[PDB]
């Protein structure tokens, strides 16, 4: 096996939202097999990284990453809210995110 996971998989969903009001300050994350509030709480302090690819190289690379902290659980069904260093692009709304094991 080449490469080791060490993170839980996730899907970076919408922003924190009304019915028709945005709130880009928080993102909503679905974490693989976590379906309840209680389970969600386990991940609360863990660090989240949205890694993404680009055409132009930057710090000599095609992959860059934005970091976040995972702030609180979100309503009954294991979803969590995550707050990031800089707000996530909505291009990301169906994308994968990584929830690391540290803190």
């Amino acid at each position: 096996l080449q490469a080791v996971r060490l993170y839980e998989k996730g899907v970076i969903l919408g922003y924190k939202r009304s019915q028709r009001n945005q709130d880009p300050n928080f993102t909503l994350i679905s974490i693989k097999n976590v379906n309840t509030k209680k389970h969600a709480q386990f991940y609360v302090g863990k660090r989240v990284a949205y890694v993404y690819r680009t055409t132009k190289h930057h710090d000599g690379v095609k992959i860059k990453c934005i970091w976040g902290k995972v702030c609180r659980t979100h309503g009954n069904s294991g979803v969590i809210r995550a707050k990031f260093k800089t707000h996530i692009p909505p291009k990301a709304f169906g994308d994968r995110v990584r929830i690391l094991m540290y803190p």
Partner: protein
């Protein structure tokens, strides 16, 4: 202890009396059991009832005692007979219903639901007039009589209520309602 199953209807013994007056030094004390969700609600109910019945209002009387009565044998099935007065959109009716339960409070809770569901009678419109435990020789309602059967047995046809952990939207193999 379960906090999803519980219905917060309690029974309160309330005692009150009209403030004594120079002209009526020795007033009459009135007592009742009242089924309500909290103690303040119970008090309010009592006051309302007083208003309805005698010349008395909260402003010219005082609560003497409020007890809160817990069921003595909260794990003994009991057959409860209840008498109600309710208001419909069209008028007012008296009725008697029977409920097999484990506490008076539980019975009351059941009753409220039933009235809401079957008659569209809202909590405001109902007045409980007496709930008493009926011996099995005096059960008049068939849905309670049936239960009172000897060696009663029935299968379990209900659909499994899985925990929202083991509830998943994608399933391997088509679940079975048959069970056994």
């Amino acid at each position: 202890i379960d906090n999803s199953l519980n219905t917060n209807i309690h029974q309160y013994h309330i005692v009150g009396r009209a403030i004594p007056t120079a002209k009526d030094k020795n007033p009459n004390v009135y007592r009742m059991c009242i089924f309500a969700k909290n103690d303040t609600n119970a008090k309010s109910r009592f006051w309302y009832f007083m208003k309805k019945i005698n010349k008395l209002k909260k402003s010219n009387g005082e609560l003497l005692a409020c007890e809160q009565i817990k069921e003595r044998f909260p794990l003994r099935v009991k057959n409860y007979g209840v008498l109600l007065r309710y208001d419909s959109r069209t008028g007012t009716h008296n009725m008697y219903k029977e409920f097999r339960d484990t506490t008076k409070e539980g019975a009351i809770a059941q009753l409220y639901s039933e009235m809401a569901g079957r008659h569209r009678a809202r909590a405001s419109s109902i007045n409980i007039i007496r709930i008493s435990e009926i011996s099995s020789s005096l059960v008049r309602r068939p849905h309670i009589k049936q239960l009172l059967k000897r060696r009663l047995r029935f299968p379990a046809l209900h659909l499994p209520t899985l925990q929202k952990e083991y509830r998943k939207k994608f399933a391997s193999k088509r679940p079975s309602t048959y069970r056994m």
